[PDB]
Amino acid sequence: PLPRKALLAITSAHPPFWPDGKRTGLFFSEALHPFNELTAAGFEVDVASETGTFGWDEHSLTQEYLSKEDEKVLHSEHNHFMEKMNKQVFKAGDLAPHDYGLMFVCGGHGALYDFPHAKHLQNIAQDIYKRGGVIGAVCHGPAMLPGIHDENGDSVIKDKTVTGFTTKGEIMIKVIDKMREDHLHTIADMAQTANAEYVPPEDPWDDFCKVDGRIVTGANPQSATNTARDTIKVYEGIVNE
Ligand SMILES: [Cl-]
Ligand SMILES: [Cl-]
Ligand SMILES: [Cl-]
Structure with a gap:
């Protein structure tokens, strides 16, 4: 039986990145919204990064990217999400x-x-996937998927339809030059190299999710809630087999 317990995976990288000089990192609403959906569906949640540490993307902490509810959580000490993020982030290798x-x-x-x-x-x-479980990933999260392998050593996304942050969007927000300077690949190029089929939203900020078997992906911060919801729907079907 697949445990009703989720691993919320977060980036450990937070370098200066944006054209105004601000650091990137974990996108705030992309942790909070899935945490809320997982909690509402009765999951226990552990948070982990590769090192055990992280920083928030600085643009994700601006009003442009925070709802009214998001900001209240951010500035609240006693809140269960913020307590987890402040005191309970594991080094992934320990778990x-x-x-x-x-x-x-x-x-x-x-x-x-x-x-x-x-x-x-x-x-x-x-290990989750081999036991028959589900992987959901939003925005730049799909950059992990090429390195997650099946029994044959192929990516779990081989021959699957996936979405994720558009190359159009990277150009529009003017980070494509920095990405090339740091030798980063776009999500679409990573997906193609893994033999997946990348599908962008009609416009770069549309709520847009793809479900292909037990791999669920979303395109951007506006897709995070529905990516988590779709991931949970897939899980619920498996445990009711
Ligand atoms: Cl920079
Ligand atoms: Cl534990
Ligand atoms: Cl694109």
């Missing part, structure tokens, strides 16, 4: 992978730096 029935992979541009080679997080996900 026993068999404890989880689902992984949810958060985004933020930091994910481009560490997720492709985040072998401890990838090991947890491979």
Whole structure:
């Protein structure tokens, strides 16, 4: 039986990144919204990064990217989400992978730096998938997926339809130059190299999710809630087999 316990995977990278000089990192709403959905569906949640540490993407902490509810959580000390983020983030390699029935992979541009080679997080996900569980991933989160393998050593997304942050969006927000400077690949190029089929939303910020078997992906911060919801729907079907 797949445990009703989720691993919320977060980037450990937070370098200066944006054109105004601000750091990237974990996208705030992309951790909070899935945490809320998982909690509402009765999951226990552990948070982990490859190192055990993280920083928030600085743009994700601005009004442009925070709802009224988001900001209240951010500035609240006693809140269960913030207590977990402040005091309970694990180094991924310490955790026993068999404890989880689902992984949810958060985004933020930091994910481009560490997720492709985040072998401890990838090991947890491979184990979940092998036991028949579910992996959801939003925005830049899908950068982890090429390194999560099936029994044959192929990516779990081989021949699957996936979405994720558009190359159009990287150009529009003017981070494509920095990505090339740091030798980062776009989500679409990572998906193609893994032999997946990348599908962008009609416009770069549309709520847009793809479900293909037990791999669920979302395109951007506006897709996070529904990516988590779709991931939970897939899980519920498996445990009711
Ligand atoms: Cl910079
Ligand atoms: Cl535990
Ligand atoms: Cl694109």
